[PDB]
Amino acid sequence: PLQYLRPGMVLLKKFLKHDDQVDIIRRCQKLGIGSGGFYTPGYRDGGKLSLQMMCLGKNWDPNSRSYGDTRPFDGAQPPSIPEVFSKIVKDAIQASNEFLRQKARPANDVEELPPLSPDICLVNFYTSSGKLGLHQDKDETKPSLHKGLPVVSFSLGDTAEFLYGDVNDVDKASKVDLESGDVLIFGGKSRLIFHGVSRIKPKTAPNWLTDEAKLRPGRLNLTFRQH
Numbered sequence: 001p002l003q004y005l006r007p008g009m010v011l012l013k014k015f016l017k018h019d020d021q022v023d024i025i026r027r028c029q030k031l032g033i034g035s036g037g038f039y040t041p042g043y044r045d046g047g048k049l050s051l052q053m054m055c056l057g058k059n060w061d062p063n064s065r066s067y068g069d070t071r072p073f074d075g076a077q078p079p080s081i082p083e084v085f086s087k088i089v090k091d092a093i094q095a096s097n098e099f100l101r102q103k104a105r106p107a108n109d110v111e112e113l114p115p116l117s118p119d120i121c122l123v124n125f126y127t128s129s130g131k132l133g134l135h136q137d138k139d140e141t142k143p144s145l146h147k148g149l150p151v152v153s154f155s156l157g158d159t160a161e162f163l164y165g166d167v168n169d170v171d172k173a174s175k176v177d178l179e180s181g182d183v184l185i186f187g188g189k190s191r192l193i194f195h196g197v198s199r200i201k202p203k204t205a206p207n208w209l210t211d212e213a214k215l216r217p218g219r220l221n222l223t224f225r226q227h
């Protein structure tokens, strides 16, 4: 149910509840079509295919590769992060730290992820041909990175094949499947892993979610960070 991938990297299988997944899709469907909604980025670190994005909270701008209050190309301010999203993020960290507490026993230090008060949510939508190349989440402020403040990532819809490793070379990357409802956290010594999405597995989204949320083919990711 909870899986240790490497120091400070925990995968919470099927962590998102039924109604929360539906609620997350429905909120992103509505925010995604309004002001500050989804657009196709001209640039992503690592390259990309069949990817649209929108930010909640602070905006990450592709053209400038920095954080700000509004999207430069249309002046839109991003919607704020729903408080229910922030609640789930904090629960995921709490659950991870309890897992790391129980797995500690005693040839090594006790692991513990730092808390997160995310003010950045990157919402990525991949259609079935989607991909995102290996990259580091390296645009947050130096104190945020130096403290190892974690990245918390929600997965919904079709399964992603997720690559991660220490370098920009797939030959040295590990693979894990991120299925609908999974939450992945990387912080501490894993905060700067290279990572990406090599493939979306078509027709893997749960039928109940496709039906209740009217989800289009593909995968929705929400990636939370603290600037």
Ligand SMILES: [Mn+2]
Pocket: 135, 136, 137, 195
């Ligand atoms: Mn990333």
